């Protein structure tokens, strides 16, 4: 037999072995988050170690099989999926440096807590007091205590090994067998390939610039709203045109801008549609809500849940004595037993995001016939993008009246709807910038281009006038602004958010262009319309028979970003914005030295 043929025999066996042990680890995770005891923890650890050992001996096998006399494309795809291998040779010293440093910060982050500089009596962990403040409290000494205490308490326990780890970051991001670890944080998307569809980080960064130049102003006004509610809650500090002093940040590092929502009112009558008391009063029944999920996909042909689905699929938190995290994690147990692990209650999350969960199930069945290497979502970016679509489309009185529960002459209140558009724009465009800054630095240090001296001067002179950051106390060169985050220690690459954002952004262009909107991207609805039903649902459901580029293009159009529907948001929100709060403006910052 050829190398291809012997490896194909070994393939015919390890497919079955992999499905079996993957399902076993799937029930292992099921018992992980359905009940928690020490024996359970040890059991999940041993099962994971066992399957990892199987994968590692498979890896050593894969190193043996050559590839040069192989001439089969799809068979070669499966062969490469088989032949991914490595990392069983590092010496004690260097392996200790890298992995021990990472795991050490992981463990201290898990097992750390803080206290107060001025009144150390009311001192508490990371979760209760600090998140209590950012969710409910509006006191200046409270927020200031939060930030200063956390900094002067956690940096002191993280910094020295992390400066030696500035050096270690340099060395291991250069050495770890690949091009660089900036592009390995971009590495599941890292490309050195062929076959016609070369789009990459060059176009990525260039459309970053062009995205600013076209659709930045709504993010401008959104920043105005959040930062202004804070500045009103603590009035009389700042000049308008420039940036803000930061002893009033509002969160830890600025992951989201969602942390700063309510009070400011240039968008200011009543808040977005909230239906707690509406569900209390009229109670459009949730069983019929899942029935309209069924119906609005039975105009396209999709089934419901089963008794086994009721038994297994768990959507909320356990809420009992069980010590589990309420982090919602999209799940599937395999073997067509698509179940879920969220923290989902009867809310807008239920209706829309559970259209999206039941669509996890339906989508799994949509790719249930895939071969071994393709049983997963075509993209996790699809999940979030179409979840936004589903929320903003099925959260609709027109759907609710098409099922016949609301009248069709609804009038709305301008300022309130305007708040809702505020928040939506906030998320959509406020994703990128600070993470862009740190990713520029990380790219070229993980490639080794920053010398060991210009870090912090670069940070400030990229903190007031180029594109926008803010941070109060001076993080001098000893501290590691390059990396000080548990999620960086946890390899959760954020910027993939923005990558799928632009992808899905022009994907929405092409898709609802085929759907033929009159203007913007919302109201791209489906309910009780058979022709639109096929023309978007058979549209969205294709499969994975070809490479990723071919799949995404054939499915959903072009490889760029929107301006037409965001522009048909802008100009109408420009006119409305006029008629209430006509005094919008421009600016983004990054070139500072504020407190010094």
């Amino acid at each position: 037999s050829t190398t291809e043929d012997l490896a194909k025999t070994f393939l015919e066996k390890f497919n079955y072995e992999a499905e079996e042990l993957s399902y076993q680890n799937s029930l292992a995770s099921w018992n992980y988050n359905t009940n928690i005891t020490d024996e359970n923890i040890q059991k999940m650890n041993i099962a994971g170690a066992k399957w990892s050992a199987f994968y590692e001996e498979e890896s050593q096998h894969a190193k043996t099989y050559p590839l040069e006399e192989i001439q089969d494309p799809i068979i070669k795809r499966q062969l490469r999926a088989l032949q991914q291998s490595g990392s069983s040779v590092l010496s004690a010293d260097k392996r200790e440096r890298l992995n021990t440093i990472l795991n050490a910060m992981s463990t201290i982050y898990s097992t750390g807590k803080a206290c107060n500089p001025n009144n150390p009596q009311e001192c508490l962990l990371l979760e209760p007091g600090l998140d209590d403040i950012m969710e409910n409290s509006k006191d200046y000494n409270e927020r200031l205590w939060a930030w200063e205490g956390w900094r002067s308490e956690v940096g002191k326990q993280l910094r020295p090994l992390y400066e030696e780890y500035v050096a270690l970051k340099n060395e291991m991001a250069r050495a770890n067998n690949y091009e660089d670890y900036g592009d390995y944080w971009r590495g599941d998307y890292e490309e050195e390939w062929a076959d016609g569809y070369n789009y990459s980080r060059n176009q990525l960064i260039e459309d970053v610039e062009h995205t600013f130049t076209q659709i930045k102003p709504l993010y401008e006004h959104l920043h105005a709203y959040v930062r202004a509610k804070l500045m009103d809650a603590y009035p009389s500090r700042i000049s308008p045109t420039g940036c803000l002093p930061a002893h009033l940040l509002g969160d830890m590092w600025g992951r989201f801008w969602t942390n700063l929502y309510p009070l400011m009112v240039p968008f200011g009558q009543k808040p977005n549609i909230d239906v707690t008391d509406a569900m209390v009063n009229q109670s459009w029944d949730a069983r019929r809500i899942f029935k309209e999920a069924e119906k609005f996909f039975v105009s396209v042909g999709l089934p419901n849940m089963t008794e086994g689905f009721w038994q297994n699929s768990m959507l909320t938190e356990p809420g009992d004595n069980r010590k589990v995290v309420c982090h919602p994690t999209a799940w599937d147990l395999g073997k067509h037993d698509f179940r879920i692990k969220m923290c989902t209650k009867v809310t807008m999350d239920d209706f829309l995001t559970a259209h999206h969960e039941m669509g996890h199930i339906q989508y799994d069945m949509a790719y249930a016939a895939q071969p071994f290497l393709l049983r997963n979502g075509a993209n996790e970016g699809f999940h979030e993008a179409v979840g936004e679509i589903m929320s903003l489309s099925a959260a609709t009185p027109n759907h609710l009246k098409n099922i016949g529960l609301l009248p069709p002459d609804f009038s709305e209140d301008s300022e309130t709807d305007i708040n809702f558009l505020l928040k939506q724009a906030l998320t959509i465009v406020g994703t990128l910038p600070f993470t862009y800054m740190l990713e520029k630095w990380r790219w070229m240090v993980f490639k080794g281009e920053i010398p060991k001296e210009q870090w912090m001067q670069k940070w400030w002179e990229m903190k007031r006038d180029i594109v926008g950051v803010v941070e109060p106390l001076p993080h001098d060169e000893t501290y590691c602004d390059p990396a000080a985050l548990f999620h960086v220690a946890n390899d959760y690459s954020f910027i993939r958010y923005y990558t799928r954002t632009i992808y899905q952004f022009q994907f929405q262009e092409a898709l609802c262009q085929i759907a033929k909107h009159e203007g913007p991207l919302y109201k791209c609805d489906i309910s009780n319309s058979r022709e639109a039903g096929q023309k978007l649902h058979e549209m969205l459901s294709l499969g994975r028979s070809k490479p990723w580029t071919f799949a995404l293009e054939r499915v959903v159009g072009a490889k760029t970003m929107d301006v037409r529907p965001l522009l048909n948001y802008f100009e109408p929100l420009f006119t409305w914005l006029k008629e209430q709060n006509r005094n919008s403006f421009v600016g983004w910052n990054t070139d500072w030295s504020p407190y010094a």
Binding site: S1, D5, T9, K13, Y23, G308, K335
Partner: protein, 85 residues
Amino acid sequence: SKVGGNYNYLFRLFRKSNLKPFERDISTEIYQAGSTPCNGVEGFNCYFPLQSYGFQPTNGVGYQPYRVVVLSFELLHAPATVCGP
């Protein structure tokens, strides 16, 4: 579908030629296809011909087992064995 699961169904993996209807082969020698003869060393294209099923109680709609029964007939001038009311 028992709670622990059932791992007691198995099929063939390797062969040289195609069979004929109503035919059966039972050889279970170490399968070799390398020019270097396989003395009986596991690995290097020498494996165990059978492969189990691995069934479980909570399998999916497409994977839940079904009991197949075939009632075949032979249609010739042979003596008949069919009756009715």
